């Protein structure tokens, strides 16, 4: 999963944006006796631990603590128009303030694919850290990324 010195991406729940991030340390908090400060479950499973990741773009932050749910391995496979499938989750750049400009790596699923005599249009659903934008059109189709998972 996420080991020290591993290359994984971290997402900011407040903005729902994904950016390159590196793993610096992995740790977990346990209860003093029988009154845990506030954890979903006692430490024991790899998912029951806390991971420390830093943002390469903004390393000044220092050390950030994030759960595995918000941390995912960096994509390693690029999907081309010919390799685009429906129902697959991919990462693309979406800018809610100015969709016609550059956006941050926002997760989204392929909704529908459309081709024209000399133009291509792709439809995908975009989800923000809290707001939803399903049924949205993707201006950039060449920028498509696949998400990798541990498989369990």
């Amino acid at each position: 999963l996420y080991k020290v010195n591993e290359y994984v991406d971290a997402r900011d729940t407040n903005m729902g944006a994904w950016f390159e991030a590196q793993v610096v340390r992995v740790t977990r908090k346990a209860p003093s006796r029988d009154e845990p400060c506030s954890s979903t479950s006692r430490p024991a499973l790899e998912e029951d631990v806390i991971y420390h990741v830093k943002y390469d773009d903004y390393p000044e932050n220092g050390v950030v603590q994030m759960n595995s749910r918000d941390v995912r391995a960096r994509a390693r496979t690029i999907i081309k128009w010919q390799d685009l499938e429906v129902g697959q989750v991919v990462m693309l750049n979406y800018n809610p303030d100015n969709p016609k400009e550059r956006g941050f790596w926002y997760d989204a699923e392929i909704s529908r694919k459309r081709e024209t005599r000399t133009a291509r249009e792709l439809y995908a659903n975009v989800v923000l850290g809290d707001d939803s934008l399903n049924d949205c059109r993707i201006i950039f189709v060449d920028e498509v990324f696949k998400i990798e998972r541990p498989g369990e």
Binding site: A17, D56, D57, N93, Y94, R102, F104, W105
Partner: peptide, 16 residues
């Protein structure tokens, strides 16, 4: 890894 690290292209927001 190497002399420097490579980053992926990504930009958004409304810079001033």
């Amino acid at each position: 890894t190497g002399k420097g690290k490579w980053k992926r292209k990504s930009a958004g927001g409304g810079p001033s």
